[PDB]
Design a protein around this ligand. Structure first.
Ligand code: NA
Length: 311
């Protein structure tokens, strides 16, 4: 019912909620803000502990909406993770990890969330010129003052992570990882496991491909982002569909669906304590809570590992 996130003292239910569809108007068209608030409220009512947001989600709006729902509950019963790096420049953004920028971003995030502390604060993307250990040290000043309780980094290369953890202050790393892109096992995993840094994957279901939602005849409307990715093209796509479908007997056996088996396999890794699947509505997040009750056998884990062995 509760996992400890690496070196941090954060205790959380193993399925968290990603909030980029709660007020993220710069990312999605036609979003309903009350639908987003009900998603956050129902996640908390159903036992999800961690809410993962970011400044770029709606350019502050996701954090403001989450903050409004937070008023309805007890602050200490929830774990809030948020992130910063995007800095407005012209009509887009550039990344900034400078000490003063990160500290000011933490202050502005607390105001949007309308709360006095953040549980986990991430450097969302690495900038080019700031030495990463100084960027992390700036967040540690906020940790010392009680404004944040843990520090994370995301989208950092292994060398950037080592510089950032120079003094051992990084508690969590968010990075791309899934059954079709398992490169993190060779690079990051040995390092995060050794240092007790919690690893949270992003893109765990490959835009639905690993959820067994498509067939080899599936096509997507023009302009659809899936059409651009190689996992979704030619014979590779058909090969991907055939392997995912071989997961159906394991899902039937555990009385869940294919995505629940894939997400449970990530949680069985010693390096991973929590998953943050996304959702647009309360009902979709509730379907992903089922994942937590799955107990894969060692034979299930080994079979999936070999079935999805790197090509
Ligand atoms: Na684990």
């Amino acid at each position: 019912k509760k996992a400890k996130l690496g070196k941090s003292d954060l205790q959380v239910f193993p399925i968290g909620l990603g909030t980029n569809a709660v007020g993220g108007h710069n990312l999605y068209p036609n979003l309903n803000e009350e639908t987003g608030k009900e998603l956050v409220r129902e996640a908390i009512r159903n036992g999800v502990t961690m809410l993962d947001t970011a400044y770029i989600y709606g350019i502050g709006r996701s954090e403001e909406l989450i903050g409004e729902v937070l008023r309805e509950f007890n602050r200490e019963d929830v774990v809030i993770a948020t992130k910063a790096a995007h800095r407005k420049q012209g009509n887009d953004f550039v990344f900034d990890n400078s000490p003063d920028f990160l500290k000011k971003s933490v202050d502005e995030s607390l105001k949007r969330l309308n709360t006095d502390y953040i549980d986990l604060f991430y450097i969302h993307f690495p900038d080019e010129h700031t030495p990463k250990d100084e960027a992390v040290n700036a967040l540690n000043e906020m940790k010392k003052a009680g404004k944040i309780r843990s520090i994370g980094v995301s989208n950092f290369s292994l060398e950037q992570l080592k510089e950032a953890n120079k003094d051992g202050l990084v508690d969590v790393l968010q990075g791309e990882y899934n059954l079709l892109n398992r490169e993190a096992e060779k690079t990051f995993f040995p390092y995060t496991k050794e240092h007790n840094i919690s690893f949270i994957p992003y893109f765990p279901l490959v835009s639905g491909l690993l959820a067994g939602k498509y067939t080899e005849d599936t096509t997507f409307p023009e302009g659809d982002l899936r059409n651009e990715q190689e996992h979704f093209k030619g014979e590779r796509f058909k090969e991907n569909i055939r392997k995912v479908n071989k997961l159906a007997p394991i899902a039937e056996k555990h009385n869940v669906d294919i995505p629940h088996i894939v997400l449970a396999w990530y949680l069985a890794r010693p390096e991973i304590d929590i998953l943050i699947p996304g959702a647009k509505r309360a009902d979709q997040l509730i379907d992903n809570i089922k994942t937590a009750d799955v107990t894969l056998s060692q034979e299930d884990i080994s079979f999936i590992d070999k079935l999805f062995a790197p090509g």
